[PDB]
Amino acid sequence: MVSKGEELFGGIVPILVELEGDVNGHKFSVSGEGEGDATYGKLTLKFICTTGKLPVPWPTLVTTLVQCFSRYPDHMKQHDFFKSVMPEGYVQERTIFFKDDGNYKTRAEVKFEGDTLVNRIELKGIDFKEDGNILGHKLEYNYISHNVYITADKQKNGIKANFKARHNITDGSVQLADHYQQNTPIGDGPVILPDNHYLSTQSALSKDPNEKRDHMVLLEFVTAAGI
């Protein structure tokens, strides 16, 4: 079989991201657009903070701001939950614990609206230190590689994932962000529940020389592995 879900991802797909956040009562909104090419694990997006200055570092929002665009090798296609649930989509939830600082909780719905794959996110951050690495913007504007470890959750008709992002601090240290994730389908239909595997993820952060708003240009490649 080649599912409806997979076929949606065969060429270039327009992407729209909308995020509403509140971190320590600092309210903010982010929009992004661009496109995905899952054949190549490829994402190209630009994000704008629509409310002025982003109160947190951009690198901290990367994981929150469409794993359905992962390149799953042919031999691992029966393990691709994300695409399996499309076009109806999935709920993605996380808790991100910044070591020695606060945490984000996120809830997102990822789904097709017509031809556009949409990521709608609510983010809530508490317990942050006002002149910590996050609210004091002490994180370097780059990103590291890491692997995202994916396991089935039979008891929820979904998946769980775990991973550590390590953000460089401007003094040369590292700020650990320990991610705990769950995804459930939005619809009632069948889903692939995968064997354990990982997503090998990389991103490059850059700026648009003409853009006056606070923003982030992102180029990202993700390939599934470990089977």
Swiss-Prot record:
Mutation effect (residue 143 to A):
In Cerulean; leads to improved quantum yield, a higher extinction coefficient and is 2.5-fold brighter than ECFP
Q: What does this protein do?
A: Energy-transfer acceptor. Its role is to transduce the blue chemiluminescence of the protein aequorin into green fluorescent light by energy transfer. Fluoresces in vivo upon receiving energy from the Ca(2+)-activated photoprotein aequorin.
- What is the protein name given in its UniProt record? Green fluorescent protein
Q: Outcome of altering residue 66 to L?
A: In EYFP; leads to yellow fluorescence, folds faster and more efficiently at 37 degrees Celsius and has superior solubility and brightness
Signal sequence region: none
Post-translational modification as stated in the protein's UniProt record: Contains a chromophore consisting of modified amino acid residues. Maturation of the chromophore requires nothing other than molecular oxygen.
Per the UniProt entry, the effect of residue 148 to I is: In Azurite; shifts the excitation and emission spectra to shorter wavelengths and increases quantum yields compared to BFP
Q: Any idea which UniProt keywords this protein has?
A: Chromophore, Luminescence, Photoprotein
Effect seen on changing residue 196 to I? In mut2.1; shifts fluorescence lifetime from 3.03 to 2.50 ns
What family does the entry list?
Answer: Belongs to the GFP family.
Where do the coiled-coil regions begin and end?
Answer: none
Tissue expression per record = Photocytes.
How does this protein assemble?
Monomer.
Q: Which GO terms describe its biological process?
A: bioluminescence; generation of precursor metabolites and energy
Q: Do you know which InterPro entries this protein is assigned to?
A: GFP, GFP-related, Green_fluorescent_prot
Effect on the protein upon substituting residue 196 to S: In EBFP1.2; shifts the excitation and emission spectra to shorter wavelengths and increases quantum yields compared to BFP
Q: What is the effect of changing residue 200 to F?
A: In H9; increases fluorescence at 395 nm excitation
Substituting residue 31 to R results in: In mut1.28; shifts fluorescence lifetime from 3.03 to 2.76 ns. In mut2.2; shifts fluorescence lifetime from 3.03 to 1.94 ns. In mut3.3; shifts fluorescence lifetime from 3.03 to 1.88 ns
Give the practical application. Answer: Green fluorescent protein has been engineered to produce a vast number of variously colored mutants, fusion proteins, and biosensors. Further generation of mutants led to more stable proteins (at 37 degrees Celsius for example) with brighter fluorescence and longer fluorescence lifetimes.
Give the consequence of mutating residue 77 to R.
In Topaz; shifts the major emission and exitation peak up to 20 nm
Q: Consequence of mutating residue 78 to R?
A: In Azurite; shifts the excitation and emission spectra to shorter wavelengths and increases quantum yields compared to BFP
- What result is annotated for mutating residue 146 to D? In Cerulean; leads to improved quantum yield, a higher extinction coefficient and is 2.5-fold brighter than ECFP
Alphabetized SUPFAM superfamilies for the sequence = GFP-like
